[PDB]
Symmetry: D2
Subunit: 333 residues, 4 copies
Amino acid sequence: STIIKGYDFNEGINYDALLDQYMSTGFQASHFAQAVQQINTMLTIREEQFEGDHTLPYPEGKQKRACTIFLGYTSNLVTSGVRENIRYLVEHDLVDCIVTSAGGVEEDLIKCLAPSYLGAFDLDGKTLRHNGLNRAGNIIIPNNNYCQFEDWLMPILDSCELEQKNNDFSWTPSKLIDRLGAEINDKRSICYWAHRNRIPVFSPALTDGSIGDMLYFHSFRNGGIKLDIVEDLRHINTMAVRSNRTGVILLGGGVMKHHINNANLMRNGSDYAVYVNTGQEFDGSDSGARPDEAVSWGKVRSDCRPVKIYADATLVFPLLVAKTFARHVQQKH
Amino acid sequence: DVHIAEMSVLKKSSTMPADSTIIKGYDFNEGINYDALLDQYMSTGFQASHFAQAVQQINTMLTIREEQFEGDHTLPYPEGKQKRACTIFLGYTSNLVTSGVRENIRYLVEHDLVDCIVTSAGGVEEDLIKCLAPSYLGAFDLDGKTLRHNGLNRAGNIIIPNNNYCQFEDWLMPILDSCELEQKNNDFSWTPSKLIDRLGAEINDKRSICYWAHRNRIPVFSPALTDGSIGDMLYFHSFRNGGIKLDIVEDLRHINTMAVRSNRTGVILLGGGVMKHHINNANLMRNGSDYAVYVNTGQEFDGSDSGARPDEAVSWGKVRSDCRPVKIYADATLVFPLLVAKTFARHVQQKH
Amino acid sequence: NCKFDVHIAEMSVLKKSSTMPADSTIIKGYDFNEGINYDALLDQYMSTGFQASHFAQAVQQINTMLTIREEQFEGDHTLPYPEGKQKRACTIFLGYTSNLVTSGVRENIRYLVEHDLVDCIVTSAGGVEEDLIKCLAPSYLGAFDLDGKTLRHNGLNRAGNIIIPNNNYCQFEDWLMPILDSCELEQKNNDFSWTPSKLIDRLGAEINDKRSICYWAHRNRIPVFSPALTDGSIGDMLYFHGIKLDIVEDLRHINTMAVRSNRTGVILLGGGVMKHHINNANLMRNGSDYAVYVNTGQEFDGSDSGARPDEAVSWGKVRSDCRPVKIYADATLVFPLLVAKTFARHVQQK
Amino acid sequence: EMSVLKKSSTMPADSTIIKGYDFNEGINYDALLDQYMSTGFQASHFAQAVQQINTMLTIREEQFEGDHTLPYPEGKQKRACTIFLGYTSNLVTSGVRENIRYLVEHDLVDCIVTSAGGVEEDLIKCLAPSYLGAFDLDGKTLRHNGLNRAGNIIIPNNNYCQFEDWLMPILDSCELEQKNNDFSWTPSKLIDRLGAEINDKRSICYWAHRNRIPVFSPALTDGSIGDMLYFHSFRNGGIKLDIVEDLRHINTMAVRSNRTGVILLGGGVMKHHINNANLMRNGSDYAVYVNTGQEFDGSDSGARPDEAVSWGKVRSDCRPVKIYADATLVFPLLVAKTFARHVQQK
Ligand SMILES: NC(=O)c1ccc[n+]([C@@H]2O[C@H](COP(=O)([O-])OP(=O)(O)OC[C@H]3O[C@@H](n4cnc5c(N)ncnc54)[C@H](O)[C@@H]3O)[C@@H](O)[C@H]2O)c1
Ligand SMILES: NC(=O)c1ccc[n+]([C@@H]2O[C@H](COP(=O)([O-])OP(=O)(O)OC[C@H]3O[C@@H](n4cnc5c(N)ncnc54)[C@H](O)[C@@H]3O)[C@@H](O)[C@H]2O)c1
Ligand SMILES: NC(=O)c1ccc[n+]([C@@H]2O[C@H](COP(=O)([O-])OP(=O)(O)OC[C@H]3O[C@@H](n4cnc5c(N)ncnc54)[C@H](O)[C@@H]3O)[C@@H](O)[C@H]2O)c1
Ligand SMILES: [Cl-]
């Protein structure tokens, strides 16, 4: 049994030791330390040799690893500075699959055109609207950002519609997001690195946002394009079924959390699971449900020892990356 | 010491406006009158005041919706759908269909009190599956490994036995075979709303929200229809002969155009997630909704769209500045049945 | 290949399920096609699930307390504090936070105390003050988003979406100072030892207003315990004003009340000292027999406020045989409806 | 297109661009945490809280006008800024105890308000340890084994039995000193005594007593100490704890302060008591909240700092920061960036 004792600053300011001793601190600090162990286990197994097919069918030529890591995050996380932390993960090819919402895709792309700014939660809606300043928490995203996005996007959508009509090509969210990653051609973009490293980005509700607004506007031109979500479901589910092992790292809740968990039901559950969300169990929401709820469904395995950290991900994810993904890249070099 | 302290704590205060509401709860010495009790939630404060404000907002929507208005009295989708003076968008999450609030939503749809529904895959499937088999009251603290061994799925303190889903598969596969045939032969493009209309027609059960939505030409939009048991069925089904394509772009055109062509719009959002953003985003197209009630447990501090206040939506133009949006911070199972008692149900009773 | 993918997946997703017990409750909400019947609607909260089910379980627990409380029992039918207090078969401890008294809930608590349906109260300094201050002047409905600097310049104090004008406190000072002069005199001349409960009994007698919880608590010999009574306006007045408030005597009084009880029920609206103090008193008798918690706190931060009732069972503050119930909700939304289905129904039945 | 493509005003030239820390630059924790300011949401609040506490600490070291001594404790010395630190009992049950102890040990805070549990668990940890358990452990099973649960932490019941053995003799002396010397006990006086008696450099209460930092607890009877006080009163009547004298001490400390700063971990009486003391001097100058409380229920616990401004408990010119978080996650890191950096600098 582990004795409760925090870090003693009489020993000096050692961040690595401080965060190790989160294990003996208790409450969510202990969950932080358990989450570091779970992710380091995923990253370790992922570098091991394994039996069978070393290729995955989607995308074409995607290599398989001992452990398939599914990374899920909400749109607000991309809107915040956590985007740089997620980009680092995808850039260094440390995750195999992404699930995010329309917001998670567009804000990442829009940031390559124009920045977002620190505001406050208590700014008045009518005053902000008069000035075309959109509020996401304490973050300002000027509406000119979206105007620039429209200018950038329509020519790409014209090409996509042409490829649909001429080549009988069936667009899915993941195929479209792969394309927008290739087009943005920016080493600061998560979507760019996902395209480069053949990490598919699935977004069943991709119409729910600016990309939606543009697709809607684009349709008047010549009828528009079609986005099939059934094919994309085949892709994510098959990836899980064909995996040697799976880990899930879910930041936030909503569709992203359920989709990744559902895909892992197809293989009778994930082997490793970290949740980093602020949701609560009392309302009966999937968002606030505990990892042990997912075990009842068979979406997380019984031998797995899932960890959930109840915290804002902007506070804890950058520190998780410091202790896991970043340490792993530093060790390899 | 005492003189400095008195200056800070003894400060004189301005006169309050003459219209100001006095805080006074319901006095049970007057007897048990539920209508009076819930009216006096207005002078109770905190969320109780928000409950009373929400009753007023929904009753305003329902009142305006009965009125005459100028212009086109038809909406393009579904075909031949009549337009009212206010278009009411009802949004709910999957767990609210897994709860008994399903019966409250069904009553609204059956009585043609709302014009448009947005819900998730769960919100559709659970409603259909409840016509085949029941869900049961369990507890939140039931062990996952033990429940899994027994094929008992847990959703909060509710048990959905996995045989319910096996039955769903038996029921759904033949319908998907017909849908695929209609896609191949008639060059028909399926969307979530078109598929949910079809499943409503097939279930043919007066206990189903989806049945009444079909019957009353109330479209159900679900952009992420593949996220659930329906997706699982869709997955398995694709191996039989290739499968069905579900286009989300056409369904976006339908909901956005419904908003753009509305005389007025009200939004009633139970929960957060895609449902909330999708309805709010459709109303951006007309420069915001005229009336808005949120009933969710989300918090602002994490910056999530889910936990955001209605005034955030005003900044984007998804809710009008004129609008006086109300959020109740509560579990919908506690407050929504009582909202229906004071709003929708009162309206049907008054009419009949 | 394709065939193996779909057949592996079907095995995981199509698992057969065990039979549910025959007494299992089917999830079914209230059907408004049956008409608007609030009593039936709230009964069927039991089969609605999530917190609605907890509401229905809480109604049953409180109705059990009120039922047992009317029964005959064995032994001493008197409690030592206050002097000449009648013991019932169940002692009900009511706890509530200051904000609840700030809200319209106060009228619901006053009704309970007025009709002598609870035996003991624990609240904070605010819970005592606001109730007294509402006899002198009213509180108004404002909004959560009102600016602090603007409100301060106007002497308007904000408590959630409720406004308490600072003149209310000035009036309180005028009213309280003469009472504190008398109390101090009684301390000096009669060697009297003041406790929070003794002082709150006195302020109840002085306010002499049938709208006041504290007035009815005094009248019905329902003790009000407030260990941190210095934490507020009463504190401010005691600061400006030579009286000693002993909290050790008051602790003996609440603990002995628990130890000498035939049965105990706890009804806790909120969290904080109120919750910990009532739960601690019941540890002395190896736990309460019935317990309803109505609060918004969460477990994850390890707070006493957010702890679930099962955690208390670990301490022995709540009994193993008890079936405690917690509703995760704002009390202003649920407490008046609990009173409609429990305390009010009970008074109507008699 | 008219509604969705509306043109936007230019942002001020000083506006902060949202950019998180790039791990391509390597693992630098000081740079990472500086970059929380541009990160957004709570991360931004973390960075603003570091600035507020560093302002308090920096100001505290400077010279100021007037009396340089405080009345309570008698030998207490006043500083340019008086820092009031508040914490709930669960943070003392956690390893954050070691972080609080470091603050008090290095005389970096002047006043302390906590609950009975915040005092008890600090002393009991010098007698026997607490262990890491889980939130989901069954109450009946734990009770059968005499294991008390606080969140995911186990406090074996023998810990409290040892406490009782340690505390009763001390209480006997306190009662003797009340009867013979006509001494009036307050919570702060009793907690000072317990700190002296524990005589253990791991204890917050030990360092508080040694550095003349007072610990106020208006509801010091609410817990194991109260239980001991209850049993002990049956011998010869027991001790008397006056809360009015202790109110005079904390209020006067604030009223005589050149400047005041508040650091509140959690809510409850601790938060209101410190805020109320500062109301006497027309509010605190600097304020950091770390709690998980929400505004919606109207509780004082979940109230934003701007509510406290309406009452005059926090000043208008102050720029209060709340971090919405479990303090076990953020407080150790706040100490790394503020209090520890300060001790390292001097
Ligand atoms: N405003 C925007 O940024 C924006 C932009 C365009 C589209 N959208 C759309 O809005 C919809 C709703 O967003 P969503 O579904 O991605 O998420 P959401 O807002 O529904 O959040 C899901 C849940 O995740 C948790 N969570 C969120 N942020 C967290 C954080 N920082 N730390 C910890 N937990 C956190 C919360 O419990 C929350 O309820 C999406 O469909 C998206 O496409 C949003
Ligand atoms: N657990 C299930 O019931 C279940 C089963 C099948 C499908 N799904 C899928 O899970 C995904 C995510 O679920 P979702 O988006 O429908 O909801 P969700 O669980 O993500 O809830 C989103 C937010 O709604 C609010 N909320 C939830 N329940 C509430 C209540 N009772 N009262 C008030 N507010 C409440 C909360 O703020 C919560 O963060 C969906 O794509 C859905 O199809 C879930
Ligand atoms: N701002 C005020 O209203 C005010 C005024 C004067 C005195 N005070 C003092 O503030 C201190 C703190 O207040 P407290 O200890 O009474 O409670 P609190 O404000 O600390 O509330 C504690 C917990 O109770 C729960 N809760 C509160 N209100 C609720 C509600 N309406 N519904 C459901 N759950 C609810 C929440 O989980 C909260 O975290 C006390 O010492 C009190 O005397 C407050
Ligand atoms: Cl095509």
